[PDB]
C-alpha cells in the first residue's frame, strides 16, 4: 500500500483525490480511515467502494486494478484530518496501512492574536523562568516567532508547538516557550516576542519589562 | 456449526464472485479456484449453502434491480453443480 499524495491543501467545495497502490491483491479487501484532531479513527469506506454508516455521500471510493482511490467531493473544514488506506490480504491474514495523507482545508487569511506571559512567581521560586508567547487562531500555518532578549534573538533555547488545524474554523494556534535559569532570567530586562505572519499588516512585537 | 464459521472465515470466495460475473457478461482460473474453495464445504450441505449465501450477501451492492439479482442468483444456485460438487437441496439465497 503506497499512498499518495502525502500532503494536500484544498479549499472548501473542491474535490480531494487520494490514491493507494496495493502490491498484491490475493483475497484483498481495501478500506479508508479518517483521523480527525483528537478523535478515534473513523471508517469511511470498506471493500474499496462501500460507504460506512454515518459517512456523508460526498465520500466515495473506487478501484482500477491495483490502484484504489478515495474521492472527497464538496470539501468541508471538518475534513481537515489524516487519511489512511487499509489492505487486509492473504492467508494467514496480513494488514497493511498506507503511509497516510494529511489534508489541510484552506481558509481566508487570518492574522494571529499575539499574547505574552511572563514566568509565574511560583516557578521563579523553583529556580527557573519560562516565558510563553501565544499566537491564536491564524491561517496559513507559516509564521516566524522568535524571542528577543535585550535585542538579542534567541535561537536554540526555545521550544515551539503548533496545534492541529481546527475542524470548525480551519485555524492554527502556536506557543513559543523560552526556558531559562533563575540566574540567566534576572540577567536581562526586556523580553519581547517577535512575530511575522502574512495576515499581519506589519511584524508584531509584544514585550514586557522584567519586574513590571 | 462453529467449525463451519471458522472455515468460512478463512475461505476466499472472491474467485467465485469474479467467475460468476464473467459468466453473465458472456451471456481464466477463477472458476477452478472457486470450485477448489467450495470443495471444502462439500461434506456439509448446510455450510455449503451458507457459503453461497455469503457470496450473495457480498454482491448486493454490485447488483441493481431484480433482473440483475435474479440473473446472478440463478448462476449462484447452479455453481456447485457446475463445480462437480453436491449442492444443497434446500437453500434460500436472501
Amino acid at each position: 500500500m503506497t499512498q499518495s499524495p502525502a500532503t494536500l491543501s484544498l479549499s472548501p467545495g473542491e474535490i480531494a483525490t487520494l490514491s493507494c497502490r496495493a502490491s498484491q491483491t490475493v483475497s484483498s479487501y481495501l478500506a479508508w480511515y479518517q483521523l480527525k484532531p483528537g478523535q478515534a479513527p473513523r471508517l469511511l469506506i470498506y471493500d474499496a467502494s462501500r460507504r460506512a454508516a454515518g459517512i456523508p455521500a460526498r465520500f466515495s471510493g473506487s478501484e482500477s486494478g491495483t490502484d484504489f482511490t478515495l474521492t472527497i467531493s464538496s470539501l468541508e473544514p471538518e475534513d481537515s484530518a489524516v487519511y489512511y488506506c487499509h489492505q487486509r490480504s492473504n492467508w494467514p491474514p496480513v494488514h497493511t496501512f498506507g503511509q497516510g495523507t494529511k489534508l489541510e482545508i484552506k481558509r481566508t487569511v487570518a492574522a494571529p492574536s499575539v499574547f505574552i506571559f511572563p514566568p509565574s512567581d511560583e516557578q521563579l521560586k523553583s529556580g527557573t523562568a519560562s516565558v510563553v508567547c501565544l499566537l491564536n487562531n491564524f491561517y496559513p500555518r507559516e509564521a516566524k516567532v522568535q524571542w528577543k532578549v535585550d535585542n538579542a534573538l534567541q535561537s536554540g533555547n526555545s521550544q515551539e508547538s503548533v496545534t492541529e488545524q481546527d475542524s470548525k474554523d480551519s485555524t492554527y494556534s502556536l506557543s513559543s516557550t523560552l526556558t531559562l535559569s533563575k540566574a540567566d532570567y534576572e540577567k536581562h530586562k526586556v523580553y519581547a516576542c517577535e512575530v511575522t505572519h502574512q495576515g499581519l499588516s506589519s511584524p508584531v512585537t509584544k514585550s514586557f519589562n522584567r519586574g513590571e | 456449526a462453529r467449525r463451519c464459521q471458522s472455515q468460512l472465515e478463512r475461505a476466499n470466495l472472491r474467485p467465485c464472485e469474479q467467475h460468476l460475473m464473467q459468466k453473465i457478461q458472456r451471456d481464466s482460473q477463477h472458476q477452478e479456484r472457486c470450485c477448489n474453495e467450495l470443495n471444502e464445504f462439500e461434506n456439509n450441505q448446510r455450510c455449503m449453502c451458507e457459503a453461497l449465501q455469503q457470496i450473495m450477501e457480498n454482491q448486493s451492492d454490485r447488483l441493481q434491480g431484480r433482473q440483475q439479482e435474479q440473473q446472478f442468483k440463478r448462476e449462484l444456485r447452479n455453481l456447485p453443480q457446475q463445480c462437480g460438487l453436491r449442492a444443497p437441496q434446500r437453500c434460500d439465497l436472501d
Epitope: - | Q7, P15, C34
Partner: antibody, heavy 125, light 108 residues
Framework: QVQLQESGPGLVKPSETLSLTCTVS????????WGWIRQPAGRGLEWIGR???????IYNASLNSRVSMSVDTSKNQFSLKLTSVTAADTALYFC???????????????????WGRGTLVTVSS | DIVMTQSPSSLSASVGDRVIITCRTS??????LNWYQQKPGEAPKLLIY???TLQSGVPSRFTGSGSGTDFTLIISSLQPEDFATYYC?????????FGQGTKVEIKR
Amino acid sequence: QVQLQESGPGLVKPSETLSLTCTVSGGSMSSYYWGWIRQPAGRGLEWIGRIFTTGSTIYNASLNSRVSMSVDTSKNQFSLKLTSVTAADTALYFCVRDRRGRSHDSNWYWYFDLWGRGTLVTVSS
Amino acid sequence: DIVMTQSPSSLSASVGDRVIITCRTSQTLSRNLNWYQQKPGEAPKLLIYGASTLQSGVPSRFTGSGSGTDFTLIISSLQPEDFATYYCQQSDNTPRTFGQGTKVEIKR
C-alpha cells in the same frame, strides 16, 4: 510456468524434527491444494498429506501423529514438519500441486500435475 | 486405503515394442486413475488422468483404458527415452495411493 522447489536441511538427527519448505513461483498459490510426497529407498511413492490455502489439512494416518503442514500465501510457500524421525524417514521429499481441474469433457478430475525436483533428507547421527 | 497393484513389477523390452502395464485396485474407482512416468533423477511426470485422458504435451505413444478395478497403460512403440518407472495412482479419496511401480528396462 508455475514451478515448485523444495528447500530445507539434507541431514536430520534421529528423534529431531525434519522441516522443509516448498516455494511456488510463476503464479500465486492462492486457492489451490498442495501436498508432499515421499520416495524412500524402496522406490515406492508415499503420499504424506494435502493442505489447502485456508490452512486445512488431510494427513496420511501412519504419520498423522508426527506430521504437520502450514501455508503462507504472502510468501507463496507451504511447509512440512515431521517430528521424532527415524531412519525410516530417510527419503526423497517432493512437493506437489494436488490439482482439481476441469477437463475438455466438462468433468472435474484430481491429479498431481506439478512436482518439485525433490530434495533428499538423510536421517542419521 | 485403496491398494494399487501393478503388473509386471519389471520388464525388459526393445525400441519399437508394445509395452502393456496392468493396474488392479482393491476397491472400485469412480474416476481418478492417474498414470505417472519417473525417469532417473527426475520427479514423476503425469501422463494420463481419468484413466484415459492424455495430459497436454504427453506423446500419443501413451494410452490408458479401463474402469472399475482394472486399468491398463499401453506404450504402443517404446522409445529409448521411455526408460523409466511407471506408476498408477488413485485420487478418488484420501489417502492418495500409488502402485509399487513398473520398471521398464530397454533391450538393445
